[PDB]
């Protein structure tokens, strides 16, 4: 048995070509985020969530914002909810492009990465236009969103959306029916429905095995109950089916984005409660109450009533949640981050039994692992 030895350290035992054991050594990107958050106000801690699954930035923001809003006992205004679903699905497109094409590039198919990253670049423009940052927008906040959409943005999202399904088609032409791609993915990393549940899998790791579960359907948040879309379900629980689910989820994301653009309502973008959301700058500069509340929100921050909540969303990589403990002050007492990739990577050894070394690359790819969220 020959023993071999973000970034990952894999310690593997091989008997010839077959993997006999796979022991991931992580922590190479552990940055004590959860401890750092204890020294921040609730607003100050928000940018940390952009830097967890740093491919799905506003979905992490949404998860944290929903948790804080739950403890605050407030709700964001309807237009903020529609924006949040709109950019949640744009973010799912960003993640699935990264997941699928880097999964392809890791096993030799390097060209789809280039075609689809020109699409990622255009979606980075949508983030930059609403928030001024291409990635770590810090746009979705407890109470709603920071700023309203600039005029002319939705028109450009429509133009991008109108053409995207053709880009997905070109990706499928390269991979879906390719016998080499199928040879690398079909019957690779088979996981049973009961094993997936007990190992704590979520998202596509569950649906690839036929489990009919999606938090946007079963436990909806924001305005997801107001949009129509289908949940892709796998039949073999292998890498190829999880690849197909991700491709089909991109198509359903465009379907949801189309409804968000048409059903976007008017109104304010953050909760009209200046004890939570800061007032408009013009109000801050004219009204005594508004200036006081601006001063206090940006120094002490709002206090959150004491309590604890586990809050989860259907992030692009699976169930992403926070167990957020408030002690009544303006700084969280404890923030545990549930990263879907933590449980998924914990199951690499189980998934890789009876496979060869080159399949371990495929299995890591089908799990969709970003070590920002695994290590936190």
């Amino acid at each position: 048995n020959l023993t071999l030895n973000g970034v990952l350290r894999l310690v593997m035992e091989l008997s010839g070509e077959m993997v006999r054991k796979c022991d991931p050594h992580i922590g190479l990107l552990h940055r004590g985020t959860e401890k750092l958050i204890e020294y921040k106000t609730y607003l100050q801690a928000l940018p940390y969530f952009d830097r967890l699954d740093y491919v799905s930035m506003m979905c992490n923001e949404q998860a944290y914002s929903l948790a804080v809003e739950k403890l605050l006992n407030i709700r964001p205004p309807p237009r903020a909810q529609w924006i949040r679903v709109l950019f949640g699905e744009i973010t799912r497109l960003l993640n699935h492009i990264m997941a699928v094409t880097t999964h392809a590039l890791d096993i030799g198919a390097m060209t789809p990465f280039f075609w689809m990253f020109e699409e990622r670049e255009k979606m980075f423009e949508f983030y930059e236009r609403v928030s001024g940052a291409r990635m770590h927008a810090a746009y979705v906040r407890p109470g709603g969103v920071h700023q309203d959409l600039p005029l002319g943005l939705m028109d450009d999202i429509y133009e991008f959306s109108k053409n995207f399904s053709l880009r997905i088609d070109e990706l499928e032409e390269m991979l879906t029916n390719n016998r080499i791609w199928r040879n690398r993915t079909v019957d690779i990393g088979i996981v049973t429905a009961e094993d997936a549940l007990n190992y704590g899998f979520s998202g596509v790791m569950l649906r690839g095995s036929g489990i009919q579960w999606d938090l946007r359907k079963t436990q909806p948040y924001d305005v997801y109950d107001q949009v129509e879309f289908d949940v892709p379900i796998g039949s073999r629980g292998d890498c190829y089916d999880r690849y197909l689910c991700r491709v089909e989820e991109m198509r359903q994301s465009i379907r949801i984005i189309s409804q968000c653009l048409n059903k976007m309502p008017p109104g304010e973008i953050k909760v009209d409660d200046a004890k939570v959301s800061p007032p408009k700058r013009a109000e801050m500069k004219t009204s005594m109450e508004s200036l006081i509340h601006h001063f206090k929100l940006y120094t002490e921050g709002y206090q959150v009533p004491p309590g604890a909540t586990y809050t989860a969303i259907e992030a692009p990589k699976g169930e992403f949640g926070v167990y957020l403990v408030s002690d009544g002050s303006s700084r969280p007492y404890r923030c545990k981050i549930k990263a879907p990739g933590f449980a998924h990577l914990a199951g690499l050894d189980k998934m890789s039994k009876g496979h060869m070394l080159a399949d371990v690359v495929a299995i890591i790819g089908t799990q969709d692992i970003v070590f920002g969220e695994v290590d936190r």
């Binding site: 002319g152 028109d155 053409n163 053709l166 009533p305 004491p306």
Partner: protein, 94 residues
């Protein structure tokens, strides 16, 4: 958009698609980089009367947890069983 007719035919035939209808590169259809100024609306708390904060104060309606048992009949489930999902009628099978 500048491709000659022959090149358009060639890359259309090679891909099997009408690529010219859905070009990846953006041209004049994008929004102008200068826009008229907005005038954003105000929320529902922007009123001069009938607007006391104690009637719209979410944080102060939060309560400590309800204790149902402390160390100081039909069976139930945590919620009704989940309903079977329905197959899509838009496209049941890929």
């Amino acid at each position: 958009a500048s491709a000659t007719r022959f090149i358009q035919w060639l890359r259309n035939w090679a891909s099997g698609r009408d690529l010219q209808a859905k070009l990846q590169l953006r041209y004049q259809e994008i929004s102008k980089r200068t826009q008229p100024p907005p005038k954003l609306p105000v929320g529902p708390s922007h009123k001069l009367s009938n607007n006391y904060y104690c009637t719209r104060d979410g944080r102060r309606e939060a309560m400590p947890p309800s204790i149902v048992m402390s160390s100081q009949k039909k069976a139930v489930s945590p919620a009704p069983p989940i309903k079977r999902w329905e197959l899509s009628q838009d496209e049941p099978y890929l």
